[PDB]
Amino acid sequence: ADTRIGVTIYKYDDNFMSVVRKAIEQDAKAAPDVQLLMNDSQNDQSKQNDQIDVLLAKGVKALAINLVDPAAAGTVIEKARGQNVPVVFFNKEPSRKALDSYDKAYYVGTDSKESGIIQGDLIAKHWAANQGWDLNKDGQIQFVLLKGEPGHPDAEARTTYVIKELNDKGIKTEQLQLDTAMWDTAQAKDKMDAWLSGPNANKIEVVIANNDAMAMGAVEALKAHNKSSIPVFGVDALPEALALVKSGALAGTVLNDANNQAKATFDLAKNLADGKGAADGTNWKIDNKVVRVPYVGVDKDNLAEFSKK
């Protein structure tokens, strides 16, 4: 009969989580016996905490949680523990100690650092092919970086590894500006606008963003100042971003595989909800209760296999 699964999305207007949400819903359409209770946490862990309580009260057989605050996994785990309900965390990764505290806690996401490394390699590649980009000809990349949420595993790894990778490849970098834009387009546009209206405006050579949404805000600000010749790099390969890659407005991005993260999340939840063991009848590779889906770099050179087909 009807298996109830509760799902929380940290914020429905997050561009990337918007794609993941729709894929989950689509995947559920195909499980006649399952009923999905979806909630928008409106970027507030307090609101999400209340939402979970409501869900548990409604007798869900499993929870699929997209945390507002990664540090709140213990809180959610104690709530789930009380009903001996399995919980599948996704996209915001909880601490390993957190995960180990409960036999029915699982995580579905990615190897965050890998996206950092891939982006670094794309920049390296394009920098090498465009010496015109070294405006002051010092052989150094004068960059600005638009960071996602502080403390967010993806934001921390992407920020560290894009620079580490460039430096490991023999490319020297000089940080002109670094600020968080919390994964949002509007805030990124305002930050970049500020940067283009200050003293360092003419020193900027490359714009690095932890995600596509922030990358798009930077593009708009560049355009407003007639500085469209400055390259921008992002992460996620959102359909909206692929068009900018096509256009030349974006230099490169990285596919964060929304469809397989959605599918893995749903399969585990359903199996656990059914009392069946997490990967049962699936090809997912679980490694100490975690599933990681690979990242893939994307630029003009291999666009044609991601772009509309």
Ligand SMILES: OC[C@H]1O[C@@H](O)[C@H](O)[C@@H](O)[C@H]1O
């Ligand atoms: O947790 C939310 C964030 O997750 C990242 O994986 C993604 O790159 C960002 O755009 C944002 O969606």
Ligand SMILES: [Ca+2]
């Ligand atoms: Ca330079």
